[PDB]
Design a protein around this ligand. Structure first.
Ligand SMILES: NC(=O)c1ccc[n+]([C@@H]2O[C@H](COP(=O)([O-])OP(=O)(O)OC[C@H]3O[C@@H](n4cnc5c(N)ncnc54)[C@H](OP(=O)(O)O)[C@@H]3O)[C@@H](O)[C@H]2O)c1
Ligand SMILES: NC(=O)c1ccc[n+]([C@@H]2O[C@H](COP(=O)([O-])OP(=O)(O)OC[C@H]3O[C@@H](n4cnc5c(N)ncnc54)[C@H](OP(=O)(O)O)[C@@H]3O)[C@@H](O)[C@H]2O)c1
Lengths: 414, 414
């Protein structure tokens, strides 16, 4: 167009292996040509994390907390093999954990939808954002074995020196067993609620909290009550304003309704075992290359976007041998659009906001037009039947998006 | 032909609405013309359960425990609307719960496969039986709310006065929240394992056991260990003889593995509830009318079979107005075959065993020949594209299976 859009302040974290390659391609072909940013970029590549003794990771989280918008590229989480591969000098903790443990918030995973790409439920036309309440990786489980008869109890001792309360979870009369301890601070539940409500107002969809309060009448009921409270004291007004609404459901009714729904709703959910933050998601159904992720902070201001997958090592290896690759960039691309979309919102930057949207529509439109990477072509035909003529390589795809983006932005000039 | 197959003692449970109708059809058109049974019939119809203050439900459970074979028709779980519709004098509990509660066991959900009916994975050609740990009974976690700052610790107090052990669940410093303790006796794990290993032998496929032994190194470790103990010590041999095996996994991996599989295997889940993935979808994708359910007890003798779906009220309603309906009877039919097949096994009744399998083949063969109910067809062409000539009535279909069962059994004697 004319002058690049003044995007504002954004925090960018560079990553590793395959994602680092496509990441640079995204900035070079889809972001920089149209937006000027006051970039606070930190190199979270493994060699740099090692070199700075992981100091860069903290600095990145610090930066996000302060500039509110963070976009992250996938990073290698060291294990024995990695320690050996790069001669690391210590097994560095996952940077995703370090970041999440400093900013707090709830992660919401979404799978971009395309009409010509199969969904678990054909009827799903609009996406389904899902945020699971989970402790960070800094959480340590409290489970033991119990070898033989005896009683197991759970106890609460007020710190003000008042009557101690004991409960008796189970008395093992014969044989042994196994037992767990679990907890949740009200604050965490509030945060969970806040991040959930906001998320729904930004997207413009109805929120649904699923719990199993029928069984955990006090545990889960706690979530239910705290949601309603926060929903009435604040939010409800805006939900009605935006034609949206909040509402509770028993995990059993959700999974059923969800199966008969067309989609388009925020699904916050508390599971029996609870969950713990992890880097990976779970292959499952649908291409990981289409799985977005967003760490939404309680304050309504801070947000960190990233793809749901990892660095895609296998793909990288081939790229390292000069082999042709076909890595999906949608998930990474959406990390940028969601970040810029949030940015534009905090600053009432109409232009940037339009840009953010445009890039997503072009991403989706490009695929629905028949242009896609191998992973998607395989969702349509199945690995065995997929031919090369069925897809584009990593670079050809990036090139197609950029072309279509150029067309999209020109057409909007009217 | 002449003399009918002499089946043995089978406990039957009549149900409600639409299923009650297809249930009698199955009996008149598919079972009674070829098999004489020593029937212990219990009317679990909503009106009758109400008239007997639910004593019929308990007598049926008592009867199943006695004759080891029970087939069941879908039943109505009363809710407020149901209470008002039948002027119930109490909101009766799920007869399914009362029965599993009395019998104990592990429910196995298996979807019947048909070559011309789309599946989740074009690769799955063999069934994927999913069984979940049936806590039910009076088991329950001990949850409570934490008023304010204080410590919450779980304690194990040995019977042999041995060293008492204390674990800290969490120290509420901000004060406020919720906490809880969970437990599990070795026996439950054992029964679970027994039902699993057995179920993998009845069918002829390997058996996996998914777990999160990485997060809950003690709790889940117990399942892994106990499943192996009981395996080596009681099933290793038998599995070998059938060229079958057993291994442990990780939920994350299992779900992937299944996707990239051809099917044919038993999957035992320790997992709780469902979420954003193919749980209830893996066991039964598409139509609920092909979803079977089997309760297997530890004793390897008792079994309760029933369709996974419900009474199909929507169809029953149409039927009441004299509107044509197309209700899939496949699930209901397999509840009868699995049951009779088990009767046959327990009594070395080669004729009955022949009949059971014979009836299943006819069902599947009939659908693969293009004769099916509207739920299917919809799976093929999609609701919008289904035309009347694409499927059959609840009746026209039961009729088609009748003529086909006759041939099948006729040409068998020769
Ligand atoms: N920074 C993060 O958020 C994050 C998250 C998870 C993992 N990781 C890191 O990644 C490394 C291990 O990687 P991983 O094996 O778990 O990989 P991954 O990136 O999660 O994906 C594993 C497989 O998913 C498919 N896939 C994922 N993204 C794809 C895309 N964009 N396009 C096409 N196919 C895609 C590929 O299947 P095919 O091979 O069948 O094509 C690939 O082999 C570790 O160093 C780990 O710490 C980082
Ligand atoms: N006894 C049990 O195991 C059990 C289990 C679940 C529910 N229920 C009871 O069923 C009643 C409510 O029923 P629900 O709404 O949950 O119904 P449902 O029987 O579970 O099925 C709901 C929908 O599934 C489809 N469907 C299910 N079985 C089908 C079949 N055999 N052939 C064709 N389509 C089939 C129909 O879709 P279309 O409407 O799109 O055709 C039907 O409306 C309650 O009284 C509830 O307690 C009993």
């Amino acid at each position: 167009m004319s002058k690049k859009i003044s995007g504002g302040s954004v925090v960018e974290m560079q990553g590793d292996e395959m994602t680092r390659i496509i990441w640079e391609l995204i900035k070079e072909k889809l972001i920089f040509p149209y937006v000027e940013l006051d970039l606070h970029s930190y190199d979270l590549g493994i060699e740099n994390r090692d070199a700075t003794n992981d100091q860069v990771t903290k600095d990145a989280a610090e930066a996000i907390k302060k500039h509110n918008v963070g976009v992250k590229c996938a990073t290698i989480t060291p294990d024995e093999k990695r320690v050996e591969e790069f001669k690391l000098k210590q097994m560095w903790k996952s940077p995703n954990g370090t970041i999440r443990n400093i900013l707090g918030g709830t992660v919401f995973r979404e799978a971009i939808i395309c009409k010509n790409i199969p969904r678990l439920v054909s009827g799903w036309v609009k996406p389904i954002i899902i945020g699971r309440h989970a402790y960070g990786d800094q959480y340590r489980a409290t489970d033991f074995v119990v070898p033989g008869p005896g009683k197991v109890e759970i106890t609460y001792t007020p710190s003000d020196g008042t009557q101690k309360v004991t409960y008796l979870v189970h008395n093992f009369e014969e044989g042994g067993g196994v037992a767990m301890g679990m907890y949740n601070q009200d604050k965490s539940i509030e945060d969970f609620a806040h991040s959930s409500f906001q998320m729904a107002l930004s997207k413009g969809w109805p929120l649904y909290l699923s719990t199993k309060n029928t069984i955990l009448k006090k545990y889960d009921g706690r979530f239910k009550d705290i949601f309603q409270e926060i929903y009435d004291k604040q939010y409800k007004s805006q939900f009605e304003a935006q034609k949206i609404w909040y509402e509770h459901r028993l995990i059993d009714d959700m999974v059923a309704q969800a199966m008969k729904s067309e989609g388009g709703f925020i699904w916050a959910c508390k599971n029996y075992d609870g969950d713990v933050q992890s880097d990976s998601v779970a292959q499952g159904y649908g291409s990981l290359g289409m799985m977005t992720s967003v760490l939404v902070c309680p304050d309504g201001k801070t947000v960190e976007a990233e793809a749901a997958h990892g660095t895609v090592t296998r793909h990288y290896r081939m790229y390292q041998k000069g082999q042709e690759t076909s890595t999906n960039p949608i998930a990474s691309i959406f990390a940028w659009t969601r970040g810029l979309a949030h940015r534009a919102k905090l600053d009432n930057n109409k232009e940037l906001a339009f840009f953010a949207n445009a890039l997503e529509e072009v991403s989706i439109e490009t695929i629905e037009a028949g242009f896609m990477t191998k992973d998607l072509a395989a969702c349509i035909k199945g690995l065995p039947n997929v031919q090369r003529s069925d897809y584009l390589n990593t670079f050809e795809f990036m090139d197609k998006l950029g072309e279509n983006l150029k067309i999209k932005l020109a057409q909007a000039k009217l």
